[PDB]
Amino acid sequence: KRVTFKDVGGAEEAIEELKEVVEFLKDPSKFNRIGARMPKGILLVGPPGTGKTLLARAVAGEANVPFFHISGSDFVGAARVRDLFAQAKAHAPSIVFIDEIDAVGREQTLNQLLVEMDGFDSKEGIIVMAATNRPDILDPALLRPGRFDKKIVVDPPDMLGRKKILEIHTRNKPLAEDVNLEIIAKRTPGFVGADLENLVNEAALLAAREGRDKITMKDFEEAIDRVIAGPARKSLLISPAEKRIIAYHEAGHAVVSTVVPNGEPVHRISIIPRGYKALGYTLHLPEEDKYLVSRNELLDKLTALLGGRAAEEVVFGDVTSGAANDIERATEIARNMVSQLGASKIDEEVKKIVTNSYERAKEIIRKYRKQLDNIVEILLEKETIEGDELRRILSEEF
Amino acid sequence: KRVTFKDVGGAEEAIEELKEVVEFLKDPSKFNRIGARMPKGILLVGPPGTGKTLLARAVAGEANVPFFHISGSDFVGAARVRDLFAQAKAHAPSIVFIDEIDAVGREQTLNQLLVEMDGFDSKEGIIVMAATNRPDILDPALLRPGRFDKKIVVDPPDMLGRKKILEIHTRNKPLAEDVNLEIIAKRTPGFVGADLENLVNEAALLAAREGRDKITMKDFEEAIDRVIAGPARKSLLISPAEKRIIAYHEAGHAVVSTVVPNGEPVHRISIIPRGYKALGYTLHLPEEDKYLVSRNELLDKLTALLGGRAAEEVVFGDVTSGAANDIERATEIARNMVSQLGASKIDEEVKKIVTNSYERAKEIIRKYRKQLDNIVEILLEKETIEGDELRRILSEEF
Ligand SMILES: Nc1ncnc2c1ncn2[C@@H]1O[C@H](COP(=O)(O)OP(=O)(O)OP(=O)(O)O)[C@@H](O)[C@H]1O
Ligand SMILES: Nc1ncnc2c1ncn2[C@@H]1O[C@H](COP(=O)(O)OP(=O)(O)OP(=O)(O)O)[C@@H](O)[C@H]1O
Ligand SMILES: [Mg+2]
Ligand SMILES: [Mg+2]
Ligand SMILES: [Zn+2]
Numbered sequence: 012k013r014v015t016f017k018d019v020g021g022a023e024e025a026i027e028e029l030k031e032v033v034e035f036l037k038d039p040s041k042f043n044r045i046g047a048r049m050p051k052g053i054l055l056v057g058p059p060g061t062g063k064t065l066l067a068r069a070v071a072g073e074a075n076v077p078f079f080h081i082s083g084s085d086f087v088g089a090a091r092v093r094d095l096f097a098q099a100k101a102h103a104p105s106i107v108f109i110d111e112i113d114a115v116g117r118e119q120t121l122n123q124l125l126v127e128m129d130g131f132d133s134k135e136g137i138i139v140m141a142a143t144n145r146p147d148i149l150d151p152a153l154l155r156p157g158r159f160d161k162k163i164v165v166d167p168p169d170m171l172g173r174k175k176i177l178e179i180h181t182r183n184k185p186l187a188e189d190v191n192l193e194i195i196a197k198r199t200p201g202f203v204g205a206d207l208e209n210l211v212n213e214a215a216l217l218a219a220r221e222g223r224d225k226i227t228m229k230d231f232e233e234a235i236d237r238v239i240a241g242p243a244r245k246s247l248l249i250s251p252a253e254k255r256i257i258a259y260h261e262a263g264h265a266v267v268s269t270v271v272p273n274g275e276p277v278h279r280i281s282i283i284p285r286g287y288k289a290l291g292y293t294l295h296l297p298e299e300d301k302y303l304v305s306r307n308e309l310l311d312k313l314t315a316l317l318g319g320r321a322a323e324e325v326v327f328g329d330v331t332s333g334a335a336n337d338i339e340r341a342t343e344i345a346r347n348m349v350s351q352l353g354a355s356k357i358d359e360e361v362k363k364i365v366t367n368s369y370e371r372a373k374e375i376i377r378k379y380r381k382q383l384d385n386i387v388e389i390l391l392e393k394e395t396i397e398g399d400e401l402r403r404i405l406s407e408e409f
Numbered sequence: 410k411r412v413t414f415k416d417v418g419g420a421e422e423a424i425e426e427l428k429e430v431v432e433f434l435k436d437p438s439k440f441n442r443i444g445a446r447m448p449k450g451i452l453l454v455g456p457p458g459t460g461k462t463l464l465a466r467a468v469a470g471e472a473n474v475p476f477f478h479i480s481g482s483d484f485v486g487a488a489r490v491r492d493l494f495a496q497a498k499a500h501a502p503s504i505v506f507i508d509e510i511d512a513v514g515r516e517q518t519l520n521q522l523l524v525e526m527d528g529f530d531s532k533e534g535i536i537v538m539a540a541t542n543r544p545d546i547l548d549p550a551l552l553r554p555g556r557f558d559k560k561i562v563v564d565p566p567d568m569l570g571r572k573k574i575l576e577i578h579t580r581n582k583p584l585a586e587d588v589n590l591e592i593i594a595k596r597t598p599g600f601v602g603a604d605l606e607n608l609v610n611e612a613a614l615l616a617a618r619e620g621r622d623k624i625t626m627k628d629f630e631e632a633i634d635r636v637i638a639g640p641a642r643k644s645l646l647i648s649p650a651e652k653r654i655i656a657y658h659e660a661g662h663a664v665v666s667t668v669v670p671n672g673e674p675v676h677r678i679s680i681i682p683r684g685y686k687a688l689g690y691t692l693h694l695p696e697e698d699k700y701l702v703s704r705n706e707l708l709d710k711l712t713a714l715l716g717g718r719a720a721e722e723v724v725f726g727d728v729t730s731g732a733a734n735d736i737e738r739a740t741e742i743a744r745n746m747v748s749q750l751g752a753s754k755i756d757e758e759v760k761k762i763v764t765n766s767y768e769r770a771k772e773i774i775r776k777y778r779k780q781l782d783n784i785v786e787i788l789l790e791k792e793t794i795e796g797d798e799l800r801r802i803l804s805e806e807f
């Protein structure tokens with residue numbers, strides 16, 4: 012089946028990134044005449060079910076060109092790679108797509124892929140795309156210049172994103188007049204596009220089982236219960252009790268950052284992760300992102316990184332998996348600080364730095380408990396605060 | 410012989426699940442006109458003698474369609490699978506049934522089955538069904554999307570279920586006026602439908618041996634003794650001494666869950682198992698069923714999982730097979746907790762977590778011994794507590 016960008020919801024930034032690829036595929040001479048050099052490979056990274064394959068297929072739909080694809084889960088291997096690149100060259104304007112590249116990137120197939128990347132001319136309109144959900148186990152040889160060197164992140168949808176996906180999959184189905192898709196979206200936090208597609212099918216089976224020719228509001232609400240429990244369950248959602256722990260953890264990061272003099276400005280607070288760091292990816296990038304290394308700015312960074320864990324212990328006396336990851340990162344930063352700012356005595360010094368920074372964050376939480384509570388109440392009602400509203404809220408408080 | 414849903418007793422939930430299949434088989438256009446997509450395969454799981462084959466045969470009776478079936482115990486193999494699917498297509502509205510699929514799911518027959526599943530069109534009213542009592546040894550390739558992906562559980566009958574089965578098999582036999590089928594049902598805990606069918610035949614042989622033309626009450630009571638002992642025995646039943654150990658084990662789970670702050674609500678307590686977890690099935694599903702991983706909720710889950718074993722040691726000083734399984738599951742959860750919340754030193758940490766949780770459960774049992782005794786007395790008289798009665802009982806106590 013053929014798809015375009017009208018079949019994708021909640022991926023505005025990725026579509027903005029891929030507009031350039033579409034334009035290049037439509038007419039390469041415009042890029043060639045001014046000496047603009049396009050990348051040879053593009054990598055898509057994201058959690059399962061977020062729609063990487065759908066985006067790859069929709070890119071070819073917008074600019075109608077041949078689409079040659081292979082899957083890494085099906086891996087004679089070196090000969091199959093050779094044939095794929097030969098078809099693309101005979102139809103110069105086209106796309107080559109490799110799905111699940113982590114399953115193959117045994118050593119003969121990888122070597123053949125590197126030979127093919129260096130052997131084709133990009134000026135005639137050939138691009139290579141790949142997708143994965145385990146980017147941190149890829150061979151470093153694939154990420155050198157002249158190879159896959161552009162990365163695009165795909166994120167789970169928010170409330171307004173979930174509503175758009177529901178409308179895409181119900182435009183060919185008859186609905187009653189009591190159906191409110193906005194209410195349904197508010198009751199499925201944590202769902203991804205694949206989960207929402209399965210939910211619509213379940214509601215249609217309940218109506219057909221009774222002979223009705225329309226789907227009603229109660230069909231949708233009963234379908235939610237059937238997909239989260241039982242011998243055949245497919246989806247997970249965030250319950251109201253779990254929502255309170257997550258809200259306090261996110262607010263703890265923002266409060267501590269605003270108080271320390273060297274902290275970074277806060278632009279968005281949400282219950283759903285959005286960044287590549289929030290998803291737990293390093294992407295083979297150095298941890299240090301500053302030109303200058305100084306003691307005061309490193310200590311402030313450590314204290315803010317422990318704000319989420321400090322809020323959990325002071326309010327609930329508990330610890331989550333996210334908090335355990337945060338203290339693992341902080342130990343790596345402290346180890347690098349000791350060797351740059353001045354075997355068993357080194358460990359004692361690292362343990363002292365982390366312990367002191369954790370106590371500092373806990374005393375900030377206690378002093379600003381009233382401000383922390385106010386942010387949590389607003390977050391539990393809208394699920395996301397950003398833009399001018401966040402600026403005003405942070406100014407009225409503090 | 411032809412059967413329908415009137416020949417099945419004590420399987421209300423399975424019949425509710427299969428009503429949709431019956432409706433689809435009767436008229437596919439109603440499902441097609443609104444875009445409702447039916448599953449391609451359905452799997453039935455349960456202990457031997459519970460009536461999986463009977464349910465499969467009764468599905469075809471309610472919607473009179475051709476019924477093509479094969480048995481896995483009779484396994485040239487690839488050619489027999491090819492012929493079975495060819496007959497169904499020529500009679501589009503029909504059923505294909507594979508019995509004892511674990512005996513075959515040597516590698517050529519399995520490959521042919523996967524080719525047939527992907528080659529037929531579901532929109533014309535074709536469904537595939539299978540049954541097994543060893544679901545945990547099935548090849549994972551059969552459970553992927555587009556293949557067998559819906560599961561239905563069949564459970565042993567309770568007291569009211571046993572009474573219904575006895576009435577089904579005595580409606581064509583002459584009975585005396587002193588026969589009370591309700592009393593007979595109370596004296597056969599642990600029997601399944603196959604056992605009860607054999608019991609009725611035994612009572613009819615005792616009457617015929619004396620030339621009588623009616624079956625009396627004492628014929629039924631003598632038949633029970635003849636099927637549980639001797640060189641030719643067929644059935645097992647729970648004795649009054651064994652009933653007390655089982656009652657204390659089940660009540661131990663419920664008491665501990667109600668006391669810990671993060672425990673789950675209790676809705677039903679019974680002497681007969683009812684769930685797929687209570688039957689010892691994993692069904693290839695992840696153990697973790699929560700969106701968020703936290704320390705406090707994991708420890709509470711571990712303590713409640715050991716409540717049954719703690720009651721046995723404090724009241725009787727004994728251990729059963731069910732208790733041994735419970736402590737085997739708890740060790741797997743503890744191992745995963747250590748690697749997520751923070752080679753020989755890892756084992757010492759796992760052993761410490763399990764030991765601490767077991768001591769916690771034992772001290773709860775001692776403090777609430779009076780409440781534990783009261784629940785056991787009611788359970789030994791009715792065999793099952795649920796609904797509003799359980800809510801009231803749990804509220805008067807505690
Ligand atoms: N943003 C979206 N809008 C609409 N449908 C979506 C979206 N994301 C996912 N889907 C639905 O999810 C279905 C399957 O997801 P898809 O295979 O595209 O995701 P993926 O990230 O490639 O998955 P995986 O990691 O499992 O390979 C698609 O057929 C599409 O119907
Ligand atoms: N719920 C029931 N109601 C009535 N009869 C039943 C019921 N369950 C089983 N039976 C009787 O059990 C007899 C044999 O059981 P059946 O073969 O249907 O069970 P099964 O689960 O397929 O067994 P197995 O695992 O041995 O293959 C059937 O002929 C039927 O008479
Ligand atoms: Mg994919
Ligand atoms: Mg059978
Ligand atoms: Zn955090």
Ligand SMILES: [Zn+2]
Pocket residue numbers: 658662717718731732735
């Ligand atoms: Zn138990």
